[PDB]
Amino acid sequence: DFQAMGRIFVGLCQVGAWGCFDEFNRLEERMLSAVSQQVQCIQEALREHSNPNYDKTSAPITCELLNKQVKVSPDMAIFITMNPGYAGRSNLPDNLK
Amino acid sequence: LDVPLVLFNEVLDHVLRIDRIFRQPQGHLLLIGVSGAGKTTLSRFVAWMNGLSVYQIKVHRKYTGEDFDEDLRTVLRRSGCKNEKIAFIMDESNVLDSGFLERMNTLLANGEVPGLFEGDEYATLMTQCKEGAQKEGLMLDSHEELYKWFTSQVIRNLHVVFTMNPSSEGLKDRAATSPALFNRCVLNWFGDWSTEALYQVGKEFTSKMDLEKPNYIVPDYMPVVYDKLPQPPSHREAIVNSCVFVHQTLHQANARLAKRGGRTMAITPRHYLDFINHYANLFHEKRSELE
Amino acid sequence: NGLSVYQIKVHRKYTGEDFDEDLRTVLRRSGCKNEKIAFIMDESNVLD
Amino acid sequence: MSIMEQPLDLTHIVGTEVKPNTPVLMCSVPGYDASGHVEDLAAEQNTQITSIAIGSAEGFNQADKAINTAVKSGRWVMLKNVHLAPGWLMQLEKKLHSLQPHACFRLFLTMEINPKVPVNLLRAGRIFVFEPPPGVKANMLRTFSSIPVSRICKSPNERARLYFLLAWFHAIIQERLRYAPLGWSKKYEFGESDLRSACDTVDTWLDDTAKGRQNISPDKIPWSALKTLMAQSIYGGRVDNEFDQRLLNTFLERLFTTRSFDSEFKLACKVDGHKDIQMPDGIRREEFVQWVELLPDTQTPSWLGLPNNAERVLLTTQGVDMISKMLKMQ
Amino acid sequence: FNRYPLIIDPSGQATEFIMNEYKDRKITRTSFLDDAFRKNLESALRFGNPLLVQDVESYDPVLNPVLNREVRRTGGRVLITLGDQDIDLSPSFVIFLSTRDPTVEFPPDLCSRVTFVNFTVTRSSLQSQCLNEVLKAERPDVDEKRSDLLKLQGEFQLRLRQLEKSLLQALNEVKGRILDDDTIITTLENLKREAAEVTRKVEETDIVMQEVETVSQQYLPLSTACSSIYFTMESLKQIHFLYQYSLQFFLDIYHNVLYENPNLKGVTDHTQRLSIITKDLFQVAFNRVA
Amino acid sequence: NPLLVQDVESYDPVLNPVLNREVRRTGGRVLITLGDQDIDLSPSFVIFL
Amino acid sequence: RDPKEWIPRPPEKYALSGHRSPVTRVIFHPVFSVMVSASEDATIKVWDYETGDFERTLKGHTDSVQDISFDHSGKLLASCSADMTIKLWDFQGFECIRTMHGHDHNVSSVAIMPNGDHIVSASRDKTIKMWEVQTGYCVKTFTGHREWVRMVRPNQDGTLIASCSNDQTVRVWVVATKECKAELREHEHVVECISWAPESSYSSISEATGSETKKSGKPGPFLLSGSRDKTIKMWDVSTGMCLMTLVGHDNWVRGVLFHSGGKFILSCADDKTLRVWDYKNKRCMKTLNAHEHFVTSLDFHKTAPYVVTGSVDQTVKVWECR
Amino acid sequence: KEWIPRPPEKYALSGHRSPVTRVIFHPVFSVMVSASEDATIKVWDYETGDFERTLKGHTDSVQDISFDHSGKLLASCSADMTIKLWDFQGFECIRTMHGHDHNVSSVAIMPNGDHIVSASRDKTIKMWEVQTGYCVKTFTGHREWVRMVRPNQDGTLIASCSNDQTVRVWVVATKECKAELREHEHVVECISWAPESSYSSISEATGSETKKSGKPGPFLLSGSRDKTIKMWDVSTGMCLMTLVGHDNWVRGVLFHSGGKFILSCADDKTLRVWDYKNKRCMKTLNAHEHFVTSLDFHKTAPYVVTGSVDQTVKVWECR
Ligand SMILES: Nc1ncnc2c1ncn2[C@@H]1O[C@H](COP(=O)(O)OP(=O)(O)O)[C@@H](O)[C@H]1O
């Protein structure tokens, strides 16, 4: 659900580890829509981490996850592995895709 | 209940049938017919005739399975422990969940729900059952024979009536979701009020109103609606025939509206009752004003 | 004084079992729930 | 009906024709989202917007709080993929009916076209349908309107030509989808995201090659880099058929070469049997946009490289289909 | 009504019509969505206060005894069993049910228990509304003239009815013969002279109605086209479920084409303005709907 | 509903709240606590023994 | 006048007296320089505390008015009365825009959430209810109190509500999920009044009780409760512990609150006195013979140095602070 | 303040079945009390014009009513020869002092709040104790019907006007008429003294010279049925200036709370506010369709009330 996925994202971002989420379409479609928000937040945090004007001496990059400010390590990434050929699997919303 | 009723042949037949069912052990009723046909009122009247206590669950928006379980527990305690004759009137609209149907299935068939009581409330049930066994003159100590006595008392005392509208697909689905409903219940098909019933209701209700026209000419081609209408109809008989025709006209109008694809609202006997009441009031008012 | 006033509601069918049940209620409230209770009773309430 | 081949002007409609009490229902066919459009609208109007994705109970809580704040502060609220909560949609409509918001308040409800969306909500708000642009000219217009003017007009003067070529390729590819067995092998999701990735790739490689110089040689443009990246990652990523990949490679090699900078370059060949599409000679954004707006109204699948008869039966169906709608609402 | 009315008004005009009718009786508006609906219902039942309840699609079954009038009379008191408690049902109590969804379905029992009152938009009513709107927008003086004269005719007809009734009452209350008491003759003469004055006032208001309608005839085709366009909009829902348009949508289109028209900045000819308004009505309707 | 009760020599000590009139105003006007139930006293009530 | 240290002084500024019945509660307008006081005669009289002149009476309640409260903007006034109704007053035009029923018995408290979109009320039927400001619908019903609930007061951020009751306890509830976060019971009698702790006081409280600094940085919301055992207990909501007990009142504590600067505790009691407590040393600094009868409520202005106190003697008094 | 009544009314209270004789204001509450000729004293909420209650103890027509400083007691007089004292907390008569033969016209509680003055047709003014009810001292010297009586601001000096054309000021301790004034053209009906805040405003209004003590001295005013309103000095007894312009018989006079204008009612169906220091304001405002009987000015609120023979009490805003 939203809470478990958010907690996993918090762990991945704090560690700085890659998240390979296999069978991502097995989630409920509403839960996919909700998770899209956290994925977008992580991606925008990484994007503004990547800009040249950022300096490591300044405040560390943080993101809003589950109503907390969590530092996002540059090394983390989110990977979803899916098989769209199975009937009954949820369809990812466009804002997530 | 201070609500007037119009008596005709079908009402007498139906109250006789309900009285027959209410006098048998483990006698349950499955009334099927259009809403507003008097099923609930007739059931309450017959229960009052036979000394049964009418119980209805007060369903609302926040009603859930636990409330239904509590109501069932109260009814079973009153029926078995207190040895009270109770008529459990329940409607299809009261069924908000399949758990409701499961509980009703078990209660109708076995006469008891195996695990409706646990813990402290099971102890309370056992104490009440012990008190009832003492009251009747029976000597029961252990829990199993007390529960057997409670089940026997519930079987002998509790009567359950389900009233529901005649939906064919709904009927087929209920034939499998609640099998006991078609085995442990006596199915009465009230249906809609017949043409004869409408004619009798109109005649009896408008008997007070004048509707007398000695110089009334019977048309050569009388648009007969009630089959048993006397061949030389009077003015009053013609008026009642016209009222029945109006009701059937509404039925055909809804039929054609649904056929074209529009949205329809079901016509009930209460529509006919409102129609005749309006006719009486308007007739009286217009006559008074004109005079 | 913050005391909860408790009076037994006797009637013609009030027996010793009812009195014991009322005593159990008062003791449960005053010993387990830490509720201060003033148990007011009249001589007329003593039917036995 | 001319107004409707133009790109949708959300700015004017939201500013003027939409009351604050009326939600902007934004229904899209599958493969399209409208979140980007209104996010850009809020960005260019300097209006704060709170975006919430529906799907969680705390999502509903955050929604209700955001609407409660914005109806007084006058900010904007987005709720995306609201078609997954029809009952909550009914409750939201009931809440919206009895409400007196700030004059600047706006609520956007992004959904796909779904039969489960409550009718009363649809009657409550104003509906906008987002779908593939009707024609190649319309698709070019939408692409050029979406991309900011300053983004195209950068230091290299060839960037505008590359952007026009990319827009034409996107339009051709996306319009080939209307003809499912012929244009491709299946309904691929060639959408705005692929276009944005392609634009970013073009910008990155052009900046890498042209070190801020005002002009660059047409042969010095990294044609191979762009061709391979589109064929493998950007537009070839969704391709799972060998022959679809071959067709994509054919289009990329026909378009993305130095010959595209020739004055006599032919975008299409013999569209009507005699005339063919001629590549614009302009070097700036405005010239390409004017050329796009000057395109003929008549469009045929020969613009896409498909045979001219490929649109016959489909059109016939729609024709008959049109009659069926007229004969159903008499 | 015999059964308590259930009103279906998407526009809501019936709602404040009901409020205005029962304002003097202190009618209370509530909803099934309110958790305190039981308290308001029992207060209205006890004190006989008119009640209006919205959002009937969330109907609370607790109203079943009230709608079925399952009252029990004992000791001169009419007891109604609301849930598990008895309430003395005041004879002045009345309840109205309202909803804004014309397409909502209802269970057959609720349909049996209530008298449905549907407020649909008819072609004639919409034509009249559009004609009044265009008259106000283009010829405000004619619009206010028509409003004032409708007020005047209402007052005059009420006065005529009152005078006729008073004349009959006077001729019916005489204790003897007319000429025995002169005050009767005074009253009859006064009533007759007032009737003559109101009749001449009615005649002059009628001729000014004649001129008002003969200047209003010019805009009738626009109103007919407006009604036709709106009903085509309503019929649009037959071809796709997404094509749901309300009356407020068409009225906003009409307001935009009337007042917010960029093509009426410098045009003053009434015929030219009417033609521009019609053309831009068609254009704006197509643009907004499509 | 004025009430007459016979056989007072079998007095039921349930009328003690009614006879002593230890009622409380507000929150429903006149409130009596009959046994465990918060009854609303009707001012027209009167009892005769 | 140290801008965070003034305390009231025995010389009163004005003794406003227009009420015909005991004054129940007195509140300050958050924005305007005006003050409001409800009484038991079903009246809500509005006074200007700078010049001490009556302005206007708000009426419409049938029975005694028990609580009045403002929103953040000061544009709406929520009031509750003994007639089982809660009225919302448009403070600009001074008309009751909405009346709310639903409480089964006397409504003894009312408060508007900080967001300004909800109204929380507590009534004698042992229930707390939440009402929408816009629609006036009851949306949530906090149950769990075993007796008459006397006051309800939300915190600064509006995520928690505290309720005192005749059941000897103070219950802290989470508004979002309706659960009972905490149940604080140390008073030996009925709890009358409660109050939350302003942010500017947390650190002070943290060093007043000797509580070590938490690694989170938030000391935890602190609550106060005056009760009829003549004691005022201050609690840590996070841990549920009574940080301290303040003793010295001679009778039931009717109102309690912090100094706006969070350095002192202002309280009033039926001993006819208003007391200023130095909770640094857990001892009462100052005592004022505020009124000639019971003191029912007090309010302390956020910025201006004024203290307004109501009383059963039908007199509302303004105190300059020096 | 510059509080001035305005032609538009707020409420025209009509509950009395008989002409209204006097209206007063409660000292602290938002309550106005009106006595009428039907032996009933009605109590109203002037802010919203809502009938509150009625007190029907008196036998004959009630003439004059008066509060105390605290507003907890209400002294009333009537033609039934008796003086009633009303407890204003529960609104029931608590002490009905008798005597003082024939119709009693006026009654007043001097600010000390322990004694009452009363005047009547029997040509004398009696003093009563609130606590006990015993007439302790009787003031004689008026040879005719004493109409209206008022004490000072500290319970030491009393003024009595009568049909005998003489206004007599009496001292509590010495029981002697220190000042007797016989100068009016026709019968004096209404009197009212000056508050503190007005004495200074008199000094430049008349040019009077301060004595050795420097205090201007206590002041009187008397309106007389000869359509003249004359303002007088307690210490000397000499005329300062006269107000003329009332069409008909004057019935009620009092000073503005700010001590700057003069507000008076008269049988001229109109209410007149007049300036005295520079004679600038001469505003005449029609108030009732019939004879206007009495009026009152609120101490702080911007409200005035008028009771008339038309059985109607009217409220005017002040602006
Ligand atoms: N025979 C009858 N004569 C008059 N009224 C009737 C009759 N039967 C039913 N009704 C009306 O129907 C109402 C009760 O309907 P009910 O029995 O609840 O419907 P259902 O049969 O669907 O349960 C009553 O208020 C009564 O007025």
Short mmCIF file of all heavy atoms in Angstrom, two decimals, chain A residues 61-78:
data_model
loop_
_atom_site.label_atom_id
_atom_site.label_comp_id
_atom_site.label_asym_id
_atom_site.label_seq_id
_atom_site.Cartn_x
_atom_site.Cartn_y
_atom_site.Cartn_z
N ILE A 61 20.22 17.49 0.71
CA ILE A 61 18.98 17.37 -0.05
C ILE A 61 18.00 16.47 0.69
O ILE A 61 18.35 15.35 1.09
CB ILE A 61 19.27 16.85 -1.46
CG1 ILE A 61 20.37 17.69 -2.11
CG2 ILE A 61 18.01 16.80 -2.29
CD1 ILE A 61 19.89 19.01 -2.66
N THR A 62 16.78 16.96 0.87
CA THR A 62 15.74 16.23 1.57
C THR A 62 14.45 16.27 0.76
O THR A 62 14.24 17.16 -0.07
CB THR A 62 15.48 16.79 2.97
OG1 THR A 62 15.00 18.14 2.87
CG2 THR A 62 16.75 16.77 3.81
N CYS A 63 13.59 15.29 1.01
CA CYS A 63 12.31 15.16 0.33
C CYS A 63 11.23 14.89 1.35
O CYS A 63 11.50 14.44 2.47
CB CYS A 63 12.34 14.02 -0.70
SG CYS A 63 12.13 12.40 0.05
N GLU A 64 9.99 15.16 0.96
CA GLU A 64 8.84 14.92 1.82
C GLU A 64 8.32 13.51 1.57
O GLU A 64 7.73 13.24 0.52
CB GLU A 64 7.75 15.97 1.57
CG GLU A 64 6.60 15.94 2.56
CD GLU A 64 5.52 14.95 2.18
OE1 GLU A 64 5.35 14.69 0.97
OE2 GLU A 64 4.84 14.43 3.09
N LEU A 65 8.55 12.61 2.53
CA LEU A 65 8.03 11.25 2.47
C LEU A 65 7.27 10.97 3.76
O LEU A 65 7.84 11.09 4.85
CB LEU A 65 9.15 10.23 2.27
CG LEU A 65 9.55 9.93 0.83
CD1 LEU A 65 10.82 9.10 0.79
CD2 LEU A 65 8.42 9.20 0.11
N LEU A 66 6.00 10.59 3.62
CA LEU A 66 5.15 10.25 4.76
C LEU A 66 5.18 11.36 5.82
O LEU A 66 5.29 11.10 7.02
CB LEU A 66 5.53 8.90 5.37
CG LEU A 66 5.42 7.69 4.45
CD1 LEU A 66 5.76 6.42 5.22
CD2 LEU A 66 4.04 7.59 3.83
N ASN A 67 5.12 12.60 5.35
CA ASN A 67 5.09 13.78 6.22
C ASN A 67 6.37 13.93 7.04
O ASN A 67 6.34 14.45 8.15
CB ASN A 67 3.87 13.76 7.14
CG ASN A 67 2.56 13.83 6.38
OD1 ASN A 67 1.78 12.88 6.40
ND2 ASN A 67 2.32 14.95 5.72
N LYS A 68 7.50 13.48 6.50
CA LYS A 68 8.79 13.74 7.13
C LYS A 68 9.80 14.16 6.08
O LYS A 68 9.68 13.83 4.89
CB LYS A 68 9.32 12.53 7.91
CG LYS A 68 8.49 12.13 9.12
CD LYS A 68 8.81 10.72 9.59
CE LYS A 68 9.04 9.74 8.45
NZ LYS A 68 7.89 9.66 7.51
N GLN A 69 10.81 14.90 6.52
CA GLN A 69 11.92 15.31 5.67
C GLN A 69 13.01 14.25 5.74
O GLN A 69 13.65 14.08 6.78
CB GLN A 69 12.45 16.68 6.10
CG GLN A 69 11.56 17.84 5.71
CD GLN A 69 11.29 17.89 4.22
OE1 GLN A 69 12.22 17.94 3.41
NE2 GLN A 69 10.02 17.88 3.84
N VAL A 70 13.22 13.55 4.63
CA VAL A 70 14.17 12.44 4.57
C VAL A 70 15.26 12.80 3.57
O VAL A 70 14.95 13.20 2.44
CB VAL A 70 13.48 11.13 4.17
CG1 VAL A 70 14.51 10.03 3.97
CG2 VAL A 70 12.47 10.73 5.23
N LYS A 71 16.51 12.67 3.98
CA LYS A 71 17.63 12.92 3.08
C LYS A 71 17.62 11.90 1.95
O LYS A 71 17.38 10.71 2.16
CB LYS A 71 18.95 12.87 3.85
CG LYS A 71 20.20 13.14 3.03
CD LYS A 71 20.86 11.85 2.55
CE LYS A 71 21.49 11.10 3.71
NZ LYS A 71 22.15 9.85 3.27
N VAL A 72 17.89 12.37 0.73
CA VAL A 72 17.90 11.53 -0.46
C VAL A 72 19.34 11.42 -0.94
O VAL A 72 19.94 12.41 -1.37
CB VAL A 72 17.00 12.09 -1.56
CG1 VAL A 72 16.95 11.13 -2.74
CG2 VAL A 72 15.60 12.33 -1.02
N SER A 73 19.90 10.22 -0.87
CA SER A 73 21.24 10.00 -1.36
C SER A 73 21.25 9.98 -2.89
O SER A 73 20.29 9.49 -3.50
CB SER A 73 21.80 8.68 -0.82
OG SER A 73 23.05 8.37 -1.42
N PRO A 74 22.30 10.50 -3.52
CA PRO A 74 22.32 10.52 -5.00
C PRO A 74 22.41 9.15 -5.63
O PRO A 74 22.12 9.03 -6.83
CB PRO A 74 23.58 11.35 -5.31
CG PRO A 74 24.43 11.22 -4.09
CD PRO A 74 23.48 11.15 -2.94
N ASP A 75 22.79 8.12 -4.89
CA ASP A 75 23.04 6.81 -5.48
C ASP A 75 21.78 5.97 -5.66
O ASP A 75 21.83 4.97 -6.37
CB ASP A 75 24.04 6.04 -4.63
CG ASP A 75 25.45 6.56 -4.77
OD1 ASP A 75 25.64 7.59 -5.44
OD2 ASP A 75 26.38 5.94 -4.20
N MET A 76 20.67 6.35 -5.05
CA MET A 76 19.48 5.52 -5.10
C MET A 76 18.75 5.71 -6.43
O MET A 76 18.90 6.72 -7.12
CB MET A 76 18.56 5.83 -3.91
CG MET A 76 17.83 7.18 -3.94
SD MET A 76 16.41 7.28 -5.05
CE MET A 76 15.40 5.95 -4.42
N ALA A 77 17.94 4.71 -6.77
CA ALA A 77 17.12 4.76 -7.97
C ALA A 77 15.98 3.76 -7.81
O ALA A 77 16.07 2.82 -7.03
CB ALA A 77 17.94 4.45 -9.23
N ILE A 78 14.92 3.98 -8.58
CA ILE A 78 13.71 3.16 -8.52
C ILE A 78 13.54 2.47 -9.86
O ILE A 78 13.54 3.13 -10.91
CB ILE A 78 12.47 4.00 -8.17
CG1 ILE A 78 12.69 4.75 -6.86
CG2 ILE A 78 11.25 3.11 -8.08
CD1 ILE A 78 11.63 5.79 -6.57
#
